[PDB]
Amino acid sequence: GWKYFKGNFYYFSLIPKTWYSAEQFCVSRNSHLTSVTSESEQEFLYKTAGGLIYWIGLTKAGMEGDWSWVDDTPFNKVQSARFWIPGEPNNAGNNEHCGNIKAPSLQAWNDAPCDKTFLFICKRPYVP
Ligand SMILES: C[C@@H]1O[C@@H](O[C@@H]2[C@@H](O[C@H]3O[C@H](CO)[C@H](O)[C@H](O)[C@H]3O)[C@@H](O)[C@@H](CO)O[C@H]2O)[C@@H](O)[C@H](O)[C@@H]1O
Numbered sequence: 001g002w003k004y005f006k007g008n009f010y011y012f013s014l015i016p017k018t019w020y021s022a023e024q025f026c027v028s029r030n031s032h033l034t035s036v037t038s039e040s041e042q043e044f045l046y047k048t049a050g051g052l053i054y055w056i057g058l059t060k061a062g063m064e065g066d067w068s069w070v071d072d073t074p075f076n077k078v079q080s081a082r083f084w085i086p087g088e089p090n091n092a093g094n095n096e097h098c099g100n101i102k103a104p105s106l107q108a109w110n111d112a113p114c115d116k117t118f119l120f121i122c123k124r125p126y127v128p
């Protein structure tokens with residue numbers, strides 16, 4: 001069921017999990033919760049998500065609580081500004097340290113509590 005896009009395969013889960021249990025599942029399939037590094041990747045992801053909410057690889061790192069990608073793609077604050085839902089990340093209840101794709105729009109991301117269960121998206125490189 002992996003879907004192909006620009007050199008990567010993507011798994012849109014059928015079972016919901018917490019952010020970390022989702023990441024573990026991804027790692028057990030030689031992948032990671034997905035990073036997003038271009039408008040075209042954001043578009044592919046939210047369109048395929050079809051209006052449902054999916055964990056992606058957004059999580060906090062460092063003392064500052066800077067956003068980061070679990071697959072170790074460097075997080076680009078400037079280039080990623082356009083990808084958040086206006087008002088996010090809002091850190092609601094001061095307990096939102098993971099990120100999902102929520103709205104079917106380029107402005108898609110929301111921060112939400114890591115212990116909440118959602119469907120999730122894994123990303124796995126194709127290596128010829
Ligand atoms: C359920 C909850 O929804 C969001 O937090 C809401 C918040 O949502 C609005 O405002 C934020 C910025 O604070 C964003 O612009 C959203 O797009 C808006 O919909 C507000 O409704 C306030 C009002 O008291 O409540 C918050 O809980 C979201 O950020 C949370 O993660 C969570 O999903």
Ligand SMILES: [Ca+2]
Nearest residue numbers: 090091092111
């Ligand atoms: Ca939020």
